């Protein structure tokens, strides 16, 4: 039974564990030191040394000789080492390439920074309410007169929202988003506070030992008058306030009692998890958890809640099989099922999380056909998994832990140290690709922003060779990774990075802006999306020239009149266009659209003729002309016949100034017309006849009388209004 | 897909969608601004009363010239009523300009097809900020009969014919806007049914680039997985598997048939009148819809001889009995009044005249130089249109496969002479085009005579849509999923019978003699039976075959009525079909030489 001590204080039971094992046994543990959740930096002479909870030396921080002060260094909330000078605070970016960015006070001449902790600063000589909200000091309060009197740097802290600040007779308040006081209690005369992640307020006297945890004011939660004042007075995650006397630390609980951890060695610092209270010693570090109900009913030294027997069910089927199917039935196999799942994840040896898993897994086949969904189980085995691979690469975290800050937040820690291997087999190992893209994008950047004499040819190989291996999508993101080749100035493989994209609209708009206009719309035609390819065009026209539009579009979209498509109504730009790029057929139906727009050929018809003239490259051209030649005939001629018979003839065709001819009655002109025009002797007969019959009862077809056959002159005579005296035609024939 | 590819959902879902985001805009009375080339198209799905009724707005203006002053009008009407412009960019790429130009002299809804795989405005950038932009999904939605559905894709707000356009240079282009706009419509429909499509056929090398972009806009959203889901959990019927023929045409395959003279009740009513993208004459008017007008749907494909004659049986079978139906029957009485009158009176009667001379054409029987007194005497005698004869001439160029040179310069001559200079440019648009040529990207065109067609596809024996004539376009459908065809006249080769699926099988050498390239068809699978189908469709099964008609460039409305006859014919003889005929939009012969310029 893992119940060897499982200390209670009235109803909850209590266990210690052991996490990790250091390797300093040494000056470091004496040596400032600071945790986050996965490292601890000591201050070794001018060598910072970032240890994980595994003796494993990630990074390493020389002191760049020393130019400021450096008084503390903690890590926020990413494992970045906030170094705090007291002239400025120089956060840490990176660690093989250390870009400590420095972030100075805005008027670094009068005051200087005297503690820092968790963003929230605190000036020297007014002291002032700061906040790191970025790369600057974004202040959240104001000094007055007589603002506080912190008797020593241990008189205050803050977590997210409460600022508690610790006056010497009142224990004033500031809350972040207004920065205002609420004065809690007029008379105090407390020494420290550990405000917890929750808000669990605590405080201490040291003159008479009275720790007096609150939630709220007005209220007291426990005043245990402990005996020899201690050493840390860390927090047992959200529930219990533990101290650190010698190697004796003690989980203090409600009403007067407390539980005893003894410890093989010293105690030197301790970080309050979100459910933990972290312990370092000299060699190993332990773990002041809190047994939960699952474990509290299932490993309980003399159990009878249907988790623990079903765990003794597990323990018999191995020699008494007949034996353990009836106790299976005894009990209600629901909440045992559930209970080794919900306790299997919380132990930390593999060899438990294999038999419990086991058990669950004995009972679980043991229900309704749909009594319960298994993914409880399959999830309880992913998570498990997870949590014992991070192990491997010296990341210790507990299922709270790891579900208060998602896979994103190991990863971030991991990236940080140049790990990006490991990271790609845990988001394997997690079945996730979203993740999977943020890791390899990561490595693009870093590598293009790393060697920067690398040649092209071989650097882009390396970007190509990795992103072969992986299999994903909609996460790689090599617009990123090309702004980052963008910016280190290596532009000739940013093309080439954007070539690679399966995103069709970021490709091209990655080019454009790469301003290799020329390839940017070239690859636009493969795609084939006219709608994207137009718009294109228009943002392209909007910061080109004129002419360099005119340049481009006459190399590359030779054969693609797409762009005169999307400006066929302003015939003045196609105008110019066609003839600048030589062409003179199509330029003739520009001049031609425009006579038929504005109901006026004439006025463009011997400039057509012209354009015919400028290329000769034809048959049909020939024939055109001569349609066009025989018009000239046509036209002169008809200012003749309104120079000698005075009647209006323009815009008359052959067809119309003939019957014109005959309505009024000529002999010659009309012989003339045939002749010169070459006019058939078969369609002179049917305009004329045509017109005559219109001409009111003409009776001249008798007189004219003298090819069509003979019978068409009854037709139009029979079938028209002049019914009457077709019999002359009836006998004619 | 039986249950989901009805075709009704799909008006009222459109319907639904814009009524959804007229709400959201605002609450207070609105004022919507529809662009004309649309305006026909929201009447199809809702009439003024409906929209009303759901939706804040009162009043609808057009973005025509016309709304320059009146602006300033619907400007105090502005304040009174917000103003929502309706504007559609997909074919035109450019925002009307009297719009734009309206913006400085005094919200914007744009359609857009339905997503596919997520669930142009820079040029009002220049004017202001704060632009909404408020999508408007849309779907293809019957319009004329359950079965036939138009994108129209065909006509952008100029009314310019993207297969032929005016302007000779942009067809390279305006062309390629319309196969992009095919596939994204398509998109629309495969996905919202959750079909998959099996073996593709596509005739015309202009069908092969909107199977090729089909596919690839297909294969980069679906893998194996995806298909397996798709086409178990779906019901599939459970029956036979997976079928779905997705037939692609294009225009210059069949052009004689736009060139012919329509015979169906609603063919001849859009060959006399201009049928727009909401099937409304505008001259008479009436609810041309078929959901409604129960006897538009049983006379709107009959042969005109009949409809008059059949109305009679419907007029006096009402005696025995309907107010609403009352006015039915006599609103196409006098439809079949109107139309039968102008038929013997206009252009000197002449329809009887135009039919007989059409087969003179179509067997070869009008001998060379036999063309100088029959297009005289048309244009003369009879005082027949120009278009009526422009179609007639380009009729005489595709039957013959050219012209004689001794008459070619004589019809391009003569065309000039009766009808201007303009003639001149008319006529060389269609040589161009392939519809009137002479023997002296390459899409395809006719090379061949009309008579070996008639004898080979028995184009000339089911001939009541046109005159005499069944359209080679129902023919190139038929030897699909039939050779029975052939084997009468074209055989001794042919691999089988009777195929469920369509096979191209054998047929590549009719072609290469016909359209001058063996390579016009081309049959590329998609997913292969019973490695990917019948795997899937036995795995529903134990643990009809919708065939999309798609009509590049325009479907006449004989070839419509003609499907639907190849579909009765085909289900009798076991091969049972569904034809979804979709397509771009109505065209014809007046619509073809109003587009050529």
Redesign the interface.
Known sequence: NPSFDWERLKDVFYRSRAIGELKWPTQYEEFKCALSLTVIAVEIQDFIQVYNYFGQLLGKINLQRIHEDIIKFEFDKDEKLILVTKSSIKIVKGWSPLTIESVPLQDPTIDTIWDYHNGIMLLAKSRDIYKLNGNEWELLYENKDKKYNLLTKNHWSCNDDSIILLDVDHVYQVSTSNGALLKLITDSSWHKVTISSRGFICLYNMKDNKLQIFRDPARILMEHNLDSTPDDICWCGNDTVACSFEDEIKLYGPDGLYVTFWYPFTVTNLRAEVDGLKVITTEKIYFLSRVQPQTSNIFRIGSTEPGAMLVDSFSLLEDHAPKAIEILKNFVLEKGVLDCIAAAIDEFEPKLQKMLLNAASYGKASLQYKSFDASIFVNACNTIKLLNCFRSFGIFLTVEEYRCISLKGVIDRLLKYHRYYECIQICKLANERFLLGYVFTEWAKDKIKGSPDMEDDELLDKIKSRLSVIDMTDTLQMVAVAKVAYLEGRFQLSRNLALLEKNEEARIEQLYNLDDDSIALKECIKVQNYSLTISLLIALSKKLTNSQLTKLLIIDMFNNPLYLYYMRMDKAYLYDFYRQTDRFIDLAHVLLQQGKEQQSLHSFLPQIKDLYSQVQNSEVVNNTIEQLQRQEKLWIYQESLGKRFAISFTNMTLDQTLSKLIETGQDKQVKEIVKKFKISEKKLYHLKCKTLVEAKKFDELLQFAQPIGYMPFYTYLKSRGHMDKASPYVNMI | MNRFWNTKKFSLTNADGLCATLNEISQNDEVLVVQPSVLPVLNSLLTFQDLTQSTPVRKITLLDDQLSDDLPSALGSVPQMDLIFLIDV?TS??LP?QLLDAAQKHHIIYCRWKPSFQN?E??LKELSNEYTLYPWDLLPFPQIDENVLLTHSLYNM?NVNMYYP?????Q???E??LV?DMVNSLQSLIFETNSIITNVVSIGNLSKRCSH?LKKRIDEHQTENDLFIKGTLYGERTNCGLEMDLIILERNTDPITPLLTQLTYAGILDDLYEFNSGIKIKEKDMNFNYKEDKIWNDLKFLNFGSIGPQLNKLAKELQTQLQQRQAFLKNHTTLSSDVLKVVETEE?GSFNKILELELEILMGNTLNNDI??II??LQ??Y?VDQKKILRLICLLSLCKNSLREKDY?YL???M???????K??QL?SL?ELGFFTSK?SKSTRLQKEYRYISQWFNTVPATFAYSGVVPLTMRLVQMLYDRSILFHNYSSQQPFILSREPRVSQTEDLIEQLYGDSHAIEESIWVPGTITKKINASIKSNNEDIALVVFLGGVTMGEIAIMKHLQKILGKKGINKRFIIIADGLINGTRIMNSI?
């Open positions: 997909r790429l450019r300009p142009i820079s040029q100029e005016n302007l000779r240079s942009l390279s282009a305006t390629s806007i992009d972009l000197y100088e007194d005289l005497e003369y005698q005082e310069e391009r001559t003569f000039i002479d009766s009808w201007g200079i303009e001149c440019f060389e040589a002296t310029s």
